[PDB]
């Protein structure tokens, strides 16, 4: 849904999406061939589903067709120091894909902005909408517009027939954060069909026991998960499916 959005925020006002109480499957993203770039700076570009993370932040904005590789830790430049800045320690992935056919219009649409210059470099994971007038020392800028001081935000000129370097490109950067809070967004769990009346190693929601499974007459309470014996030995489980 967030990839199929109708409106995309500017780089200086990149939208952040926080995901919780949800199971995220990356198989569709991996198998989607519409992405022109899937370089990931995380621990593994395939074990993302297997890994368990507490929370995920998605940053989506539109930049030039070029400098897509420029969105990375370090890599000093205009976009790095005066636009959305990626921290030097980043464990997420960078996804880029072309969207010329829908977001590009004739006449050079100016709905997309970007920050040209500020007093200091932008800290990682920062959003700036103040758009205060930049000063160049002399500061003769008590009026709306003065010398050496103008609007720091510049409007992108995007054209479908323009060179691919100047063509609209979509980048979505996802960040994985580890905190003291318990994990709430991890990959789907694969479950096989149960087999009964056979000594089979089983993993019932982390129980990890071995034995023979057979139907039972005991009445588990609805909230209960797995029973126990006098000697605290697991002797009954409730099937989650």
């Amino acid at each position: 849904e967030v990839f199929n959005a109708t409106r995309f925020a500017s780089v200086y006002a990149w939208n952040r999406k926080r995901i919780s109480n949800c199971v995220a499957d990356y198989s569709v993203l991996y198998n989607s061939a519409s992405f022109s770039t899937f370089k990931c700076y995380g621990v593994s570009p395939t074990k993302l589903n297997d890994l368990c993370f507490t929370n995920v932040y998605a940053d989506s904005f539109v930049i030039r067709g070029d400098e897509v590789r420029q969105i990375a830790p370090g890599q000093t430049g205009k976009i790095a120091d005066y636009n959305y800045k990626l921290p030097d320690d980043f464990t997420g992935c960078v996804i880029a894909w072309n969207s010329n056919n829908l977001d590009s219009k004739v006449g050079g649409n100016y709905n997309y902005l970007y920050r040209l210059f500020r007093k200091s470099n932008l800290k990682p994971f920062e959003r700036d909408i103040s758009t205060e007038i930049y000063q160049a020392g002399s500061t003769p800028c008590n009026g709306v517009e003065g010398f050496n001081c103008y609007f720091p935000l510049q409007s992108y000129g995007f054209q479908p027939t323009n060179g691919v370097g100047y063509q609209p490109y979509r980048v979505v950067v996802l960040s994985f954060e580890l905190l003291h809070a318990p994990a709430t967004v991890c990959g789907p769990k694969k479950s096989t069909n149960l087999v009964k009346n056979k000594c089979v190693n089983f993993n019932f929601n982390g129980l990890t026991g071995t034995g023979v499974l057979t139907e039972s007459n005991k009445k588990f309470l609805p909230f209960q998960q797995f029973g126990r014996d006098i000697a605290d030995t697991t002797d009954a489980v409730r099937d989650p499916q």
Epitope: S36, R64, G65, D66, E67, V68, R69, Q70, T76, G77, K78, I79, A80, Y114, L116, F117, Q154, G157, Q159, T161, N162, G163, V164, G165, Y166, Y169
Partner: antibody, heavy 118, light 111 residues
Framework: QEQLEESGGGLVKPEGSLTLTCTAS?????????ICWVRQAPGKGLEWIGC???????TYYATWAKGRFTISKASSTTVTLQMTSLTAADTATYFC???????????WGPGTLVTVSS | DIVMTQTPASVEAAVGGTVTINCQAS??????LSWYQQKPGQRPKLLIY???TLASGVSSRFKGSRSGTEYTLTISDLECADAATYYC?????????????FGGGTEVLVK
């Protein structure tokens, strides 16, 4: 209006390093894919070599001169310049031209003259 | 690197006339092509935005046809000012890597 200007030494020793200054009346701070590596041979013709983006990515050199030529854009007041090494019978004239949309060169700069011989 | 060729630079006309010049490349991409005016002893000028357009401040006779893999440009009504060599520039189409291949060009001679 927007205009590109160049300045450089008239003479250089053979296989000597010479710095080519370039200034632009327009700021061109973030969206200028300008090229000053187009090599105009005297009476023969131009030959593009490399470009530069404002993002400090160094872009590409096309392996025309391999790595002996480099771009170090100082930014500031539209200050851009290039270093040359192992220059041997290189052509005198080359212009700092700005690149607009559709991968073109809208505005070129004044000619420059360099002599490889001592 | 992008390899390219072009027609011989010899162009001869007596009074005006229409002369066609073909400047093509084997791997040149579509819709990304621009020519220029190279006045001897003068600054080069742009005349076309892309794919045989007019740009701004250019005579309506500076047209062309994209056609197939070959790229042909048509120039008519040659004059003393128009008696300057023209250069065709081609560029690659890729974000990761791009390069330009300047042509040998054709020289306009007016009798």
């Amino acid at each position: 209006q927007e205009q590109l200007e160049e300045s450089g030494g008239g003479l250089v020793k053979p296989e000597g390093s010479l710095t080519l200054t370039c200034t632009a009346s327009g700021f061109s701070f973030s969206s200028s894919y300008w090229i000053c590596w187009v090599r105009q041979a005297p009476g023969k013709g131009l030959e593009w070599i490399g470009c530069i983006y404002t993002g400090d990515g160094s872009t590409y050199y096309a392996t025309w001169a391999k790595g002996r030529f480099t771009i170090s854009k100082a930014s500031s007041t539209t200050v851009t310049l290039q270093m040359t090494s192992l220059t041997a019978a290189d052509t005198a004239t080359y212009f700092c031209t700005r690149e607009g949309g559709w991968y073109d060169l809208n505005l070129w700069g004044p000619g420059t003259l360099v002599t490889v011989s001592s | 690197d992008i390899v390219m060729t072009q027609t011989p630079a010899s162009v001869e006309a007596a009074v005006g006339g229409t002369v066609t010049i073909n400047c093509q490349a084997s791997e040149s991409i579509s819709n990304y092509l621009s020519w220029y005016q190279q006045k001897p002893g003068q600054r080069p000028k742009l005349l076309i935005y892309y794919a045989s357009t007019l740009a701004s401040g250019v005579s309506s006779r500076f047209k062309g046809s994209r056609s197939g893999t070959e790229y042909t440009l048509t120039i008519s009504d040659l004059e003393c000012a128009d008696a300057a060599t023209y250069y065709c520039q081609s560029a690659a189409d890729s974000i990761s890597d791009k390069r330009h291949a300047f042509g040998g060009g054709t020289e306009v001679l007016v009798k």
